[PDB]
Each structure stands twice: as C-alpha cells, then as structure tokens.
C-alpha cells in the first residue's frame, strides 16, 4: 500500500508486512546490459544464500539457530515495536557473517538428519 | 511426448501433463539471453511470492470467483484448451495474481505463529 521502501521508516514489525512489495522490485547499450546482468547476479546470490539455509521460496523463514545475547541484548518489545530495519541493519552489521555461517551449518545438519530419517525403514 | 508446445491444441486436462516439456525449453545475442533470463526469473519470483516455489502444479487457498469464469470443470479441463482459457481470463489475471500474493502473506504469518507455540 505504501510502495517500495515506503515502510523503511516504519517499525520492523510493521515493515515486515511489505516483504512482497520489496521483493517485486529487485528484478525490474552496454551499460544497460551490464546493469541487467548485475541485477540478476545480485538476485541470484541472495536466492542461493537463502537456498543453502533451507529458506528457498519463503519471505519469512524461521530457523533453529538460537539468538546469542551478545549479538543484540534487546527484548522483542524493543526490537520489533520501537526499532526500524535500517537501525537494526546498522546495529548488526557486525555479527552478520557469524549468523550466516551458523545458518549454513544448521541447514547442513538438518539435511543430514532428514536424509537419515527418510532412509529409516 | 509430442514435443515443445505439441499439446498446445490439446485440452487443458491433457496439456497439463506435459508441463516439464514446456519448462525445459524456457532457458535453452546477449540482450536476448539476458531478456530470457529476466523473464524466467520474473516468473519464478511470482511463483515464490505465492507458495508455489518449486512446483509446476500448485494448489492454493484462493477460491475461484464465478465472475472470473462460470464454466464447470467438465468444460474447462475436458473441452477447453489452454489458449482459449488464457484468452477468456486475461481481463482478470492481474486480479487473481494479487489475491494469490495476499493469501501467501497471510499463510506466512500464520505459519510463523504456529511455529511460535512452545
């Protein structure tokens, strides 16, 4: 309803309801071709990064990685109701790669466990 | 197998069994390659906004409105072809897609809440 990035200044709990609005605007002479290839590569890298986490095809993907209190010692009543996604993105610029590595490792363990359970007669 | 588009003149209930033949011919001068990739990715993004991420046949929670088409299934699937059907519901396609998006958004929140119960 608010359009692309319209919820950027709203709280992240409210901005979480506009994920499809943001997603639809990521895909749409030599400079035009380079720009289009670059947009495709950024989209595909984000989709691969979601895929290796078991979040393919989802915009809201819950995981089984616990939140470390050292990453951000805040309550949900403060993170989701009184903070925006931009402020959060600034706050956890550090530790983002730690979270991504833990998500990748958790998905590898989940894929092995699912393979062993499905192979269990 | 009939080949690419070989079921185009067949009925919907027959052509719907050849979806992989059509799917395998969507990916396989630079402007043409990038345009084909963009069209493929836009279609896959529309499928991923809906819950139909990895499926070629996907059942949704959007009820069918009789104002879009009032034909019964014995005509749509057994008598009508996909070209005639595509012509019939062009005027409502953008409505239907919007509702599909809304349904998935609600589903995602509901799933997020259902997985939130201890």
């Amino acid at each position: 309803s608010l359009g692309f990035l319209g919820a950027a200044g709203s709280t992240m709990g409210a901005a979480s309801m506009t994920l499809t609005v943001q997603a639809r605007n990521l895909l749409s002479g030599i400079k035009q071709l380079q720009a289009r290839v670059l947009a495709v590569e950024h989209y595909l890298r984000d989709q691969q990064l979601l895929g290796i986490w078991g979040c393919s095809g989802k915009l809201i993907c819950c995981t089984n990685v616990p939140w470390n209190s050292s990453w951000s010692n805040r309550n949900l009543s403060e993170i989701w109701d009184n903070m925006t996604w931009l402020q959060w993105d600034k706050e956890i610029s550090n530790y983002t790669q730690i979270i991504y590595g833990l998500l990748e490792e958790s998905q590898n363990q989940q894929e092995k466990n699912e393979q062993d359970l499905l192979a269990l007669d | 197998s009939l080949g690419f588009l070989g079921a185009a003149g067949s009925t919907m209930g027959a052509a719907s069994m050849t979806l992989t033949v059509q799917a395998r011919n969507l990916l396989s001068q630079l402007q043409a390659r990038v345009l084909a990739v963009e069209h493929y990715l836009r279609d896959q993004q529309l499928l991923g906004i809906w819950g139909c991420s990895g499926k070629l046949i996907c059942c949704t929670n959007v009820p069918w409105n009789s104002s879009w088409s009032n034909r019964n299934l014995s005509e749509i699937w057994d008598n009508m072809t996909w070209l005639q059907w595509d012509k019939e519901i062009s005027n409502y396609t953008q409505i239907i897609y919007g509702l599909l998006e809304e349904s998935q958004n609600q589903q995602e929140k509901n799933e997020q809440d259902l997985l939130a119960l201890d």
Partner: antibody
Amino acid sequence: EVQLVETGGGLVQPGGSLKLSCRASGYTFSSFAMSWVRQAPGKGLEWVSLINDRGGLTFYVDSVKGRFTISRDNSKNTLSLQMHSLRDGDTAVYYCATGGMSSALQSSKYYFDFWGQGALVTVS
Amino acid sequence: ALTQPPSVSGSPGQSVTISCTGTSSDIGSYNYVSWYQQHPGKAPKLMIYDVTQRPSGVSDRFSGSKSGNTASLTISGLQADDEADYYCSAYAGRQTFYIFGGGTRLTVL
C-alpha cells in the same frame, strides 16, 4: 485497566445453537490474542477456545472442535462464539479474556491477563 | 488435571503454600505456570504469571516457585486475602493448551 463486556443468550434446548459475544474497550484490540474460558456453576475453570490477534488461527479442546466456532472482528472490537449441538453439560458461565498466545514477534505470555464480567449459558 | 491441596488454611499473620502438580507434559517441560484469584461473585484476575512474576497492579506478598514437576504459590501475611479459590494453570503444549485442575479454597479464619 481495560473493560470487557460480554453479551449472553437465554435458555436453549439440547441440539440447538447459541451465540455469545464480547466487546473490548481501553486497549488496542487487534494487538492481543483473545480466548473463551468456561466455568460450570459448581466446578473450577476450564479453557475452551483461543484465537490469535488477527483471527486467522483458532484452537479448541477436543470436546468442542466439531461444535464451537470462535470468530473475531478487529474493526468492531468484537468477539463471538457460536456454539452448536449444546448439551446440558455445557451449562456454565463463559468468560472472554485478553491473553493466551502471542504472535511470535511479541514477548511470550501463555497466560490469561484481563477478564470480562461473565455471561451465563443455560441449556435445558 | 492439576492436583491442588484440599483448601489449606491459616491464621492472619502467617503464610501458606498452595501446591500445583502434574506430569512432565504439563509442568515439568514448561515454565509457563500462572495463578488466578477468583473472588466469589466476581471474575478471576491474574495474580502470578511465568512462575515467579506478578503483573502491575498486584501487591507483594504473592510469589511462587518451581521444582521438578511441582509448582507452588506462596502467600504471606493473609491481610484480608479472602477466599478466592486460588486456581493454578499451566501450558501443556499445542494439543492441550491450558488446564486448571481443581482449586484451593484458602480461608484466613
């Protein structure tokens, strides 16, 4: 701190239907999950149904899953409970309450907090 | 479901413990145990939530504890803490959301 006012019904025969409702005031209705809890005249409290803040998810005890429907209207700040196939064992005071489950982005509750004033259901 | 003592009693100026017990799926596996005060003729109000916490508007001398599969409500003073059944409740998973069991008609003589 908040006000919850139920509207009840009268006497219904076995096999009939009865609609209860609850109105909320003094807080944002759409921000909290709501529930219905039953109390027989001579027994303790029994939870019957729970609905989330958006109205999309409903939960029931096994004994009422095929009989009771809970509905929520966030624009009228109104709850309703439509009960079918009532039996004499369902004669009780029903309360609406704010509490129960929270919608994943909120602090965990799993408790009832604000209670209404009660509504009587009498079944012949 | 939840077993409670048979309406314990005590003098004004003394304290009581009201137990609430169950199985591993009701108490042992969850820390979501709450207590409610239901005055006769009035609706119940929240007294204790999350085992040890009390909401704003509720006075002190009401506390609780948990060990094993047993939770308890400690009430001190009994300063006109009139009989109000003192119901316990616990979360028992997705299939059985809430159970209350019985009640404890505490009297302050």
